[PDB]
Write an enzyme that holds these catalytic residues in place. Structure first.
Site, mmCIF file in Angstrom:
data_model
loop_
_atom_site.group_PDB
_atom_site.id
_atom_site.type_symbol
_atom_site.label_atom_id
_atom_site.label_comp_id
_atom_site.label_asym_id
_atom_site.label_seq_id
_atom_site.Cartn_x
_atom_site.Cartn_y
_atom_site.Cartn_z
ATOM 1 N N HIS A 1 0.864 -1.232 -0.104
ATOM 2 C CA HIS A 1 0.149 -0.025 -0.097
ATOM 3 C C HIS A 1 0.934 1.276 0.090
ATOM 4 O O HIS A 1 1.978 1.284 0.276
ATOM 5 C CB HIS A 1 -0.924 0.007 1.327
ATOM 6 C CG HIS A 1 -0.048 -0.038 2.430
ATOM 7 N ND1 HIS A 1 0.504 -1.036 3.052
ATOM 8 C CD2 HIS A 1 0.062 1.146 3.252
ATOM 9 C CE1 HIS A 1 0.972 -0.643 4.121
ATOM 10 N NE2 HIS A 1 0.851 0.591 4.357
ATOM 11 N N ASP B 1 0.403 4.986 1.771
ATOM 12 C CA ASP B 1 0.035 5.209 3.174
ATOM 13 C C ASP B 1 -1.375 6.207 3.020
ATOM 14 O O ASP B 1 -1.206 7.296 2.416
ATOM 15 C CB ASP B 1 0.955 5.873 4.211
ATOM 16 C CG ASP B 1 1.751 5.116 4.574
ATOM 17 O OD1 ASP B 1 1.288 3.623 5.067
ATOM 18 O OD2 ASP B 1 2.866 5.315 5.213
ATOM 19 N N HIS C 1 4.629 0.560 0.385
ATOM 20 C CA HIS C 1 5.389 -0.380 0.982
ATOM 21 C C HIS C 1 4.530 -1.669 1.908
ATOM 22 O O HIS C 1 3.512 -1.436 1.540
ATOM 23 C CB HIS C 1 6.100 0.443 2.436
ATOM 24 C CG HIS C 1 5.115 0.950 3.165
ATOM 25 N ND1 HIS C 1 4.478 2.093 2.834
ATOM 26 C CD2 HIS C 1 4.500 0.640 4.192
ATOM 27 C CE1 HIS C 1 3.540 2.408 3.876
ATOM 28 N NE2 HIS C 1 3.765 1.651 4.799
ATOM 29 N N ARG D 1 7.057 5.803 14.293
ATOM 30 C CA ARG D 1 6.802 6.102 13.052
ATOM 31 C C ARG D 1 6.532 7.843 13.354
ATOM 32 O O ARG D 1 5.601 8.160 14.327
ATOM 33 C CB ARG D 1 5.881 5.548 12.295
ATOM 34 C CG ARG D 1 5.659 6.376 10.780
ATOM 35 C CD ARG D 1 4.736 5.358 9.835
ATOM 36 N NE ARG D 1 3.513 5.288 10.382
ATOM 37 C CZ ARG D 1 2.442 4.656 9.599
ATOM 38 N NH1 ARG D 1 2.957 3.853 8.596
ATOM 39 N NH2 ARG D 1 1.307 4.417 10.033
#
Ligand SMILES: [Fe+3]
Length: 244
Positions: free
Chosen positions: A71, A73, A203, A218
């Site tokens: 996908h 993000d 990713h 993150r």
């Protein structure tokens, strides 16, 4: 000196000579941004000194701070993130790699007839809140000018196509995007930090560590609404823009 070392033909570079933090000067931040834009995902090793506060402060130098399927993000939103900065905190004894694909080279390598297809194709992305967005399949990157493919797991269908059709075309595009020649699989070590440009990548997390404990932290940077090759912006069907 800062050093940028290419890891594969189309994607990935390791950046040496940098200690990530609040205090990096303007020229250092310029180099880091340039490397991110060109190589799509970049890696800093032995950042053992870093914590959440310094990660966040560093993220602010690059922008405004905001799993097992491939996908891009948050693409159910119109103004989905530009980039993320991801720091290894605790890693399993084996497995736990991460995959990235370069959606710029994926476009560039398309055969001409497929370029004609994608440049006028639109996809409905959804999160099932009720977020629904019609994005163009080709987005013009706002800092590089590169045409990049916009697809990935949030796509529910292509606008005006039947579901069998949409699936066939989705799989064809994904297979090019996620081809080994177009991707990098990173093996995380303690002190590693990855930064990727969400406007030119997909990713994918990998479930190959048998549910051993794994933690990464993150920070995500605000992005803008995609523009297609004719200047048309993404259309919000349901929901609202990300705001902070
Ligand atoms: Fe993700």
């Amino acid at each position: 000196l800062i050093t940028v070392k290419k890891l594969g033909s189309r994607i990935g570079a390791q950046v040496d000579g940098v200690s990530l933090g609040a205090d990096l000067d303007a020229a250092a931040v310029d180099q880091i941004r340039a490397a991110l834009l060109e190589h799509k995902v970049i890696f800093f090793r032995n950042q053992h000194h870093l914590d959440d506060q310094q990660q966040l402060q560093f993220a602010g130098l690059l922008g405004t701070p905001i799993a097992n399927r491939w996908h891009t993000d948050v693409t159910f939103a119109a103004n989905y993130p530009a980039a993320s900065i991801l720091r290894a905190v605790t890693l399993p004894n084996y497995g736990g790699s991460t995959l990235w694909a370069n959606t710029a080279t994926a476009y560039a390598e398309l055969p001409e007839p497929l370029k004609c297809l994608v440049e006028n194709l639109w996809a409905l992305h959804t999160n099932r809140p009720d977020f629904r967005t019609e994005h163009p399949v080709v987005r013009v990157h706002p800092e590089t000018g590169e045409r990049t493919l916009l697809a990935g797991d949030f796509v529910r269908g292509f606008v005006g196509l039947d579901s069998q059709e949409s699936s066939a075309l989705f799989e064809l595009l994904q297979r090019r995007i996620t081809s080994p020649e177009n991707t990098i699989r990173w093996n995380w070590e303690s002190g590693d930090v990855a930064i990727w440009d969400n406007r030119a990548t997909q990713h994918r997390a990998i479930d190959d560590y048998d549910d051993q404990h794994r933690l990464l932290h993150r920070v995500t940077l605000m992005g803008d609404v995609p523009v297609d090759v004719h200047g048309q912006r993404s259309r919000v069907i349901s929901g609202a823009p990300l705001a902070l």
